[model samples]
Target chain A: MIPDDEFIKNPSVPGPTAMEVRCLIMCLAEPGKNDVAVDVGCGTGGVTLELAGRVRRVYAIDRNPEAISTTEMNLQRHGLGDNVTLMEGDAPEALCKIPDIDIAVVGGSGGELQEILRIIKDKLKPGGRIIVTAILLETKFEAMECLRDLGFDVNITELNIARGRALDRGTMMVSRNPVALIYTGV
Target chain B: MIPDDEFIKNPSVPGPTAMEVRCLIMCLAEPGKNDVAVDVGCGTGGVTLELAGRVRRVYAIDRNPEAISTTEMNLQRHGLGDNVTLMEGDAPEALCKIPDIDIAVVGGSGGELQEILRIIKDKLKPGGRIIVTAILLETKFEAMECLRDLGFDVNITELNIARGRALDRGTMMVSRNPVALIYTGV
Candidate 1:
């Protein structure tokens, strides 16, 4: 369990990853003890560090230097620097340099979900899994449709999280942005 | 946005629904302004109270006396006693006394999932929705199969939740039992 405080926080970027969504993606991915995974658009490497502990190696790729640097800081901070190779470049392009992967987690696709999926289809192992997280309904629909068209068995899970917050009256559960996790495997 | 603190504590029974699962169920059910709902095996009415806020009326049924009493206490505690009608008896059987419902949420079926669904099919309004939460894979498979056979449009979402807890070195996220939310509409 990575506590929220342990991450090297970067206020400018979207996030490392929310703990609950990370766990769900981990469960869906089911990375093997010896598997290799790629975190596409690895914003701050929240999911990157998580995959590091479960798999043999992780390739954390991001287009933004700030995100790559933040992920690098987190990997070192958590002593997971060796397990992950941080790449600073756009996905599908940066992805070409990496080995074939057993799992691919797309946290941010930069509006190229279909293109990313097209590339991942060739890079993923025979039994490999792909998990995409989308906050917008349009993204979810596109991802699901693309995955299905590619002939992968698709499973969708929508995570709506609410955290307990203390209030003067008592306690209230505040909701974060809902995310749809679209999973597919060959 | 019911807080965990508001529920009457009963360690013996399962639980008031987890706040997040409750919210997801609410979204899937989409109770209308004049809708009425039935919560089969309502347990401590965690979900029953949640529905009370969104719908016109709710009938919360539980077989166990302790669970029924606990739910009663919670409804009153949250000042939702008027909106919900608490019934103490086994599900599918106890479900008989309730009026036709626009939505049904089954938290615990006591090994009677198919039978409960059979009853719900007859009692549910046209276009009404049924949401079932199953922790076991076998239950999920059985519920999904039964729903499909009944000719409803079924959708499944597996909720895997992990909450961040403070640790000496960093924050560690601990997982709760993952639940599959199986939804269907007539």
Candidate 2:
């Protein structure tokens, strides 16, 4: 149940698109519940909110202060203030002190490719799930290789979405291009 | 331009879906107009008609007599009777007698994968293009291996289209699963 205004204002970042977020939520909810999770580059907290619903607790960290603040407000609006803890700071550095997690969502960290993945490998518990939404080819391939090397079985799904829009007294739907969602776990 | 009814009908025998036809047209049109081409199993001449305006001449061959009849009738409808040749019999056998071509389209006859590909290999001129639509995995892989062995570069694309249907007083498109389009040639 994402609002249309939030959809526009949040403006899709460089990471996960709307369809990818939905797919990620469906996959993560398969375990029925994720006890503890972390969201890197949480953005407007789409992934964080999604994780909060299926997980007992989530640490939604982002480098952008405005994005972190917006995420806090969004979570609080949903009465999930207690479920998600919004932290302000860049990833890898912020992820360093975090303890083992059950699941981690790496949305993106402004092209901080190697560092964020390295932290994910170090922090996630055995059998923990890591979901990365990468837009750039270099980062996408690097994350794939790194997660594979870290002994995680990876599943990559690309979703292309198109929605209806009205113009000139007529309505048409146009494709919004493609986005990739990669899931990996021990 | 195919009429609605004929465009929707399943070729005399099961063949590539409509989305597959779209993929093939796009692939062939990529090289622009005046290219020489062939449509093996050009059932009812749907793709054959689509290719007529793009290429100089098209050898539209089909083993099904009904398919050949429908193709001839449809080609006359578009006033393209002179640009296409409707041949009856196995495509691989018919192909050997045709002149060297720039592009070849393999639409049907998955049951005779090796024979069709062998003909394609021998008939396709240098830098020629081939688009083979295979719905089954075994045929797709066999064609892939054959093309690879022939030292031809290959690219694969999948088209998944759903037809709209009425369900519970609301219209929705049913999932049509996925089909692959293999594009290759020397």
Candidate 3:
């Protein structure tokens, strides 16, 4: 188990994926020892590190160079640098350079989720898995629709995480960003 | 947001805490910057780490030496070593050494859950919080009854985490261990 603070992250860059979301994505993908995976919009490389540990290889891509760099630092911090190839580019186009993948996790799409899923639908090997994490209701709807349109079997899980904190007078529960994990199998 | 992989863990030891359970415990405890907390049966230090991050100090105790060692390693790994004091001994008995706590998280009770909760009810500061994570229905029932007997306000959230996986033919949803997060406020 990796402690949450082990990663080197930049506040300005997209934040790292939450622990619960990472676990759900991994559970959904079930990447194998021989599998090759891709993490689109890898952000701070939270999912990238998770995939790297489970699969043989991981291709982590993000349009933000800072995100790419952070991912690089995180991957190395976990001694998983060798298992991942970090790319600084947008999805779909950036995805073209990676070989066929057995598992793909989409953590961000920058409003190009459909296009990203379309590319993944074509490149993912038969029986491959695609798991998308979205915080917006619209993104979840679009992702499920696109995956269904591509003839992939899809399922969804919505997660609402709240953490308790000591307040001024008493303890209070603080809710984290609610997210939906959309899974597609080709 | 801590990544689940960030904590150092020994699989042979008591397994790490589940992500959803961790979230609920934190939410229910509502830890504050000035609060002190206690973690009973700090298996692999999952709840210990979560509490350490939110509160000023945490007293983590377990009957198993291996669990103590694991929590110690995890606490140091996350740079949370100073925030948590690790103790190796049984609950209710071990809890005596700690000061009055604002929050207590019970992750494991070793069949003495009722007795443990009884002690916590006596020691926890007025307006303090207690959260219990129970996987067994019997444990949940007992925990609720104990909390109610102590004249505390009780609530429960049942979490069923179903993740999707790629299969030979299509996608499949896999369920993780279902747990009930039982919350009590004094």
Overall lDDT per candidate, in order of appearance: 0.80, 0.69, 0.79
Give the TM-score of chain B in candidate 3. Answer: 0.91
| Location of the lowest summed lDDT over 10 successive residues in candidate 1 chain B | B162-171
Ranking by DockQ: 3, 1, 2
Task: Show pairs that collide, candidate 2.
Answer: none
lDDT of 2 by residue, B108-164 (tens): 753676788787778777788888866555556776887787778877776655455
**Model 3 agreement with the true structure over B1-186: per-residue lDDT tens digits:** 354567676755665766655755665676799999999988888888878877999998889888899889887777887888898887878987889989988888789998999888778887899988887879877887788788887766566665555577755666777677788744
Q: Model 2 compared with the native: what TM-score?
A: 0.49
Order candidates by TM-score, high to low. 3, 1, 2
CAPRI quality of model 2: incorrect
Candidate 3 off by > 4 Å? A167-170, B1-112, B116-186
Superposed on the true chain A, the predicted chain A of model 3 yields a TM-score of 0.93
Tens-place lDDT per residue, model 1, A67-150, is 999988888878886888988977878888989999999988788889989999898888899999887768877887798789
DockQ of 2: 0.02
Check candidate 1 and list the clashing pairs: A1-B172, A1-B173, A2-B171, A3-B171, A3-B172
Which of the CAPRI classes, incorrect, acceptable, medium or high, describes model 1? incorrect
* DockQ of model 1, rounded to 2 decimals: 0.03
Best candidate (score: TM-score): 3
Please, what are the lDDT tens digits per residue for candidate 3 over residues A1-186? 343466787986766776656755765677799999999999888888878888999998888888999888888777887888988877878888889999988988788999998888778887899888888878977988798898877777767654445445743556667677887644
**Which candidate number has the best lDDT?**
1
lDDT for residue A158 in candidate 2, whole number 0-100: 62
Clashes of each: 5, 0, 19
